[PDB]
Structure formats: structure tokens, C-alpha cells
């Protein structure tokens, strides 16, 4: 059979690992079924992939995802020979309608850096009470978050949780989720997404979009305009500002070259 | 106090057991340890073993023979080589394994899918065990001793309480690492537990070139089986016993290749 061969880039946004694909037509069909050969572990390994063309970054499924275009951001300043400590890279995302002006900078080596990136705004805040339990809810357009703090809640597995949210949403259409369960002793997140299409959940190394979540919810209810945020393979900070939320965070170019699939 | 050092690297899939192989560096580098332990990282490229090219040799990042890394170093051989049709014999070395080691590479499917099979160490001990209640086929070699246990030939029983059975025997025993193979016979099905004491923790390996063997040799004598196909948890491997002398057939597909940035 014919051997498909890619460009490929392997990025680690805060151990929220990312490839990104060059050279390839980012509106294939295929991608989807590619995307998820690219990311098992028989395979090089990542949480996500994306597709860049020019300025734009084509994600596997049009979403939106911080950590992604903070890595392309990265990557442009690693190939750009004008980059020397700072530097601000306009791009685009598939699920964010604005252009993107990344504030890209040097975080000791040349191949690490720092990337900040503007999040979307939310949609609704609320704090709901389920049973027994206190939760925060963050919705967003795509996912909707919800802020379990370990501390301010009894004694409970995970799983209880991530079952009774499954229940909240039982008459409420939604395409994704996540729990941002939350430890104020060390200010840490444990992200948890479920999504349709995979029919279960994953623990992320990081999540960009729940920072937030995390972030709108630390600021209408403790006052907390931005914070560091470890996660479980690296940490994330939210930054409010003007009524405007961004996520800054290290990044690290890991890889480079070809990728060999079948066709 | 800010460098980028760049290598160039080779990723391959040996029947599941992840291998980063580097090409063009000093194969004696001190620090090659310390390079083998971030390049694994899953923050970093993905491998479950690093290994270090020269010309015909590899060199693993302890100084260990490992059948499936040899695999996938001959594999690469005959990707590199234009010459390569179906099939081609290839004459390497591995640090660990003092004889030369000729591997059949073949044709899997495309370019980038082989059949390699290699020329295994011999055991250095074949003996059954009997612990407490259940029994299991001890087959020592020169760095690791693996336990074989038939499920199908053995009562009800847990795997962790085998495993903590297993740690116990090993007490008197000075160990760097053992291994248990959890043997189903119905699917030819087989579970590589593997443990350390430095680590002191265990893990189901994707696939166990050296445990297909341990298992092979006492299949040999419990049943008279000279050949047959373990499937494993994530790939699988064939045992094939010929004129007294062990191989170890399985697929290697080759997934990527270029440059790797590490920070020095």
C-alpha cells in the first residue's frame, strides 16, 4: 500500500501535547481518521493535532483550543530569524472568530518559551447546588465547565462526581464537558473531558479553556484576578485584565521531520 | 546557561515496545543516560527505550541487549536501503549480546511495515516452582529471571497475589528485576508483568521479546510446542524453536523521523 508522509511538528503547550501538521491540505477529509493514528501511542504520541497553513491553525475538528494556537505561536517565533526576546504573532484558529495576537517570548532555551493568548469570554455563570454537593458552572460556546473545589465539599471519589454531573446534564444537549476538580491547598486542577464522539472521559495533562473557567470562577468569588494554576503535566496562568481573559503558560518545541502513515 | 542541542532521531514501534534509536552521536556519552530519560518522557517525544546508532551497532542506553530494539534497528536497515525488496538478512550488534546478531527482515504490508526475526539468548535455567498453592515455570536468564503461570492450568487465583507471592520467593534471592508471565492458553494470550526494585513498582509492558522466550522454552517442555504466535497487550510476537536455538519473530513499523530538541 502507498506510505503517506507528513510534516510534522511536536510541541508540548504546557503538557498539553500538541502536533501540528504542515504542508498538508487542512480541509482534508481524512483528517479525523489520521488525526487519531498520529496521537496513539503505537504512533508519536499527543492529546491533540493540528493542521497550519500560512497564519491559520486548522484543529482536527474545528475547535478551538488556547494551548494549540499558543504552540503554533510558539513555533513561528522558533523559525522566525527576527525573533529575539519578545515578540507579539497574529494567527487564526478554527472556533475563534478574531484574530489571535499571541505575546510569544523567550523562557531560557531557544526551542522553550512563553506564550499568552486571549480566551474567549463565557457565556453564563452560575452556582449550582447538585444533591449534596456545591459545584461552580462556567458555559462556554462548545463546552461547559464545572468547578468541583475539592476543599469546600465533603469527602467523595471523583467518579461520583463525573456520574451526578452526567446526571445535571441528562435533559440538557451539549456536545462536551468538563470538571475542573480544584485544590485550594495548593491551588492545582485535575481537568476531566468527556465528549460525545469518544463516549468517555480524559484526564488532560492541562487545559487551557478550563484555567478559565477556574479563572472567571476565582474572580466572581474570591476576588482573584489572576493566579498559577498547576496541572497534572504543567501549569497554565489566567490573566483578567480589563474585563478580558488570558492564559499565559511555557512552551517547548520537542521534535521535527517526517511522519510515516498509510494512505 | 541556555542551549539547544539537536540530534537526529528515529521512532519505531517494535511490536508495541516504543524505541527511540539516535543517529550520528557519540554512542559512549556520559550523558546519554540523562538524554535517554527526558527523550522518554511523555512530555517530550514518547519511547518506553532509547537506543544509539553506529554504523551496524545499537547501543541501549544501559548497555542491555534487547531483542525487540534489534528488531527495529535491522527494520531500519532495510528502510534505508534501496536494495531492500521482500526480504534481506542484516548483520548487527547490540551492546549486551557478544555474538553477532543476523536479522531476517521482510517485507509487513508498505514500505515502512517488517517481519524481523532475531536470534534470542539462551536460558541459563528451566524449572517449575510451586508457591503456596499454584505453580509456575521459573526460566532464568542473565539479567532478569521471568515467572511463567498458566491461568488455564491453575485454580482460581488474582493477579496481584501471584505478584506479591512472586516478590516474596524473590527475598532471598538478589534481583535487579523479574518478570511474570500471565499465560492464557485458550487465546495464547500473555500479560508481561514486569518489576524493579529500583522503580518498586510493576508494569504490563506492550510486549516482552525476552518474555515470548521464557515462555517459549517452557512451553517446549510442558507441552512439546516449538512454534506459536503470543498475543500481548499491545502487539504481538512468534516464538520459533529450531535446532536447539531460540528466535523471536514480530512486526516493526517505522512511525517518524528527523530532529529532537533538547535543552543542555
Given at each position: 500500500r502507498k506510505v503517506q508522509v507528513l510534516d510534522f511538528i511536536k510541541i508540548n503547550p504546557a503538557g498539553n501535547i500538541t502536533i501540528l501538521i504542515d504542508?498538508?491540505?487542512?480541509?482534508?477529509?481524512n483528517i479525523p481518521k489520521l488525526s487519531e493514528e498520529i496521537m496513539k501511542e503505537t504512533n508519536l504520541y499527543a492529546e491533540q493535532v493540528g493542521f497550519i497553513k500560512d497564519s491559520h491553525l486548522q484543529m482536527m475538528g474545528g475547535e478551538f483550543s488556547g494551548n494549540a494556537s499558543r504552540a503554533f505561536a510558539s513555533l513561528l517565533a522558533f523559525r522566525?530569524?527576527?525573533?529575539?526576546?519578545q515578540k507579539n504573532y497574529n494567527i487564526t484558529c478554527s472556533g475563534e472568530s478574531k484574530v489571535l495576537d499571541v505575546d510569544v517570548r523567550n523562557?531560557?532555551?531557544?526551542n522553550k518559551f512563553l506564550a499568552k493568548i486571549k480566551m474567549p469570554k463565557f457565556l453564563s455563570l452560575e452556582e449550582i447546588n447538585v444533591d449534596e454537593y456545591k459545584l461552580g458552572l462556567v458555559r462556554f460556546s462548545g463546552i461547559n465547565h464545572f468547578i468541583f473545589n475539592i476543599k469546600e465539599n465533603?469527602?467523595?471519589?471523583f467518579e461520583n462526581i463525573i456520574d451526578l454531573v452526567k446526571k445535571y446534564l441528562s435533559n440538557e444537549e451539549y456536545s462536551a464537558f468538563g470538571i475542573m476538580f480544584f485544590d485550594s491547598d495548593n491551588l492545582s486542577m485535575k481537568p476531566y473531558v468527556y465528549v460525545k464522539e469518544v463516549g468517555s472521559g480524559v484526564y488532560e495533562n492541562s487545559c487551557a479553556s478550563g484555567t478559565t473557567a477556574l479563572g472567571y470562577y476565582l474572580k466572581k468569588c474570591?476576588?482573584?484576578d489572576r493566579a498559577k494554576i498547576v496541572q497534572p503535566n504543567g501549569w497554565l496562568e489566567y490573566i483578567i485584565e480589563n474585563d478580558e481573559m488570558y492564559i499565559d503558560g511555557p512552551v517547548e518545541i520537542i521534535a521535527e521531520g517526517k511522519i510515516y502513515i498509510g494512505k
Open positions: 504542508n498538508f491540505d487542512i480541509y482534508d477529509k522566525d530569524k527576527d525573533f529575539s526576546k523562557d531560557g532555551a531557544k465533603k469527602e467523595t471519589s474570591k476576588n482573584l
